[PDB]
């Protein structure tokens, strides 16, 4: 439940937003040197139409004020800094991300794109289940990487396919976060590739924030060591405090249920992490239906025209807490809990299956 003065946080960034967006608003009340309708700094290069559209097509199982909070709680509760985090991401992400989660595998196996595929084929990094908490976990395994094996760009787009389905697994009323065990058996030299941990850190500190639950090393070797010493002074300090050694089942079993650990490290998870079943496609039927998706997005435009207008009179009301700004408040939640309900009607119409939709483990 955010506070009094969380909410004026909350209320400046829509504001910043929507001036952008040229949706009409009067932030007047709850304010940078705030000038009616110019647009921030951090967004001045944005073009208003591009980015209103895409921003509401990256929304997909998460509220609006949930997605936005992310940045804010990131950039602790700064405007200013806030907005800029929010400006580079919208500039960097664009359209490329939605067109990678909607493509999934299928995309990349269609346009031979050898380097992903290679690293979807070595199930490097995947979504094993659940921790305790009911994050996704994503269980990579270091000891199958190759800098030959994909450049730079494809190690990049893989990275980012992952977190993009693990987001799909995010569960109503818990942490939206991911827990990530990194599985350091049998690492050696062949796999010491300082470049993706660079990217990783950088690209995912400043697109993904407040996206970490916890971070598991697991049975680090002693060759580790002196590895670690150099990366860990490259982490965002709050997210070093996330990561913990785990050396055996019993401290795993304090993240992760054994129905979700895999067999080979003392659980009962008996995925098959040696042969990889690429998504076959018979679970797309409903991609070629454009008259129904036609009809949920236009009811997703409905959505999302209510929820701007009653943002912007919510930012405007003046006094707090009497019944008309109560109900205002209310309404921002139903109309939260009905874009969500729409993302759940429009995913298997724009959306391919990935291999966890056909696994039984994802279903949004």
């Not at 976060?177 to 590739?193: A, E, K, P, Q, Y």
């Not at 992490?273 to 797309?284: A, I, M, V």
């Not at 036609?294 to 959505?303: D, F, T």
Request: aromatic letters at 10%; charged letters at 25%; a negative charge.
């Amino acid at each position: 439940q955010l506070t009094e003065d969380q909410e004026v946080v909350l209320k400046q960034i829509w504001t910043h937003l929507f001036h952008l967006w040229q949706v009409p608003v009067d932030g007047t009340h709850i304010f940078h040197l705030y000038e009616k309708g110019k647009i921030h700094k951090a967004l001045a290069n944005l073009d208003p139409q591009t980015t209103k559209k895409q921003f509401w097509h990256d929304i997909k199982n998460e509220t609006p004020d949930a997605t936005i909070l992310k940045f804010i709680r990131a950039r602790k509760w700064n405007a200013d800094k806030t907005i800029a985090m929010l400006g580079h991401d919208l500039y960097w992400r664009k359209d490329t991300i939605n067109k990678i989660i909607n493509g999934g595998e299928r995309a990349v196996y269609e346009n031979n794109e050898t380097g992903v595929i290679k690293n979807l084929e070595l199930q490097k990094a995947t979504i094993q289940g659940y921790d305790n908490d009911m994050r996704p976990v994503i269980l990579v395994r270091p000891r199958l990487h190759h800098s030959s094996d994909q450049t730079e760009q494809e190690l990049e787009k893989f990275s980012l396919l992952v977190i993009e389905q693990s987001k799909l697994f995010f569960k109503e009323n818990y942490p939206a976060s991911t827990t990530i065990l990194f599985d350091l058996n049998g690492f050696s030299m062949s796999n010491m590739d300082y470049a993706p941990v660079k990217f990783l850190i950088t690209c995912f500190e400043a697109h993904y924030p407040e996206s970490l639950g916890h971070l598991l090393i697991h049975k680090a070797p002693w060759i580790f060591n002196p590895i670690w010493n150099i990366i860990k002074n490259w982490l965002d300090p709050v997210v070093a405090s996330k990561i913990v050694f785990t050396k055996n089942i019993d401290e795993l079993h304090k993240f992760i249920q054994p129905q979700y650990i895999p067999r080979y490290l003392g659980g009962e998870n008996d995925n098959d992490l040696d042969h990889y079943t690429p998504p076959d496609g018979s679970l797309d039927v409903h991609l070629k239906d454009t008259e129904t998706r036609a009809m949920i997005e236009k009811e997703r435009e409905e959505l999302v025209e209510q929820f701007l207008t009653v943002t912007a009179q919510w930012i405007e009301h003046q006094p707090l807490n009497d019944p008309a700004y109560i109900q205002l408040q209310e309404k921002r939640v139903q109309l939260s809990t009905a874009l969500c309900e729409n993302y759940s009607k429009l995913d298997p119409y724009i959306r391919s299956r990935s291999v966890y939709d056909y696994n039984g483990s994802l279903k949004v």
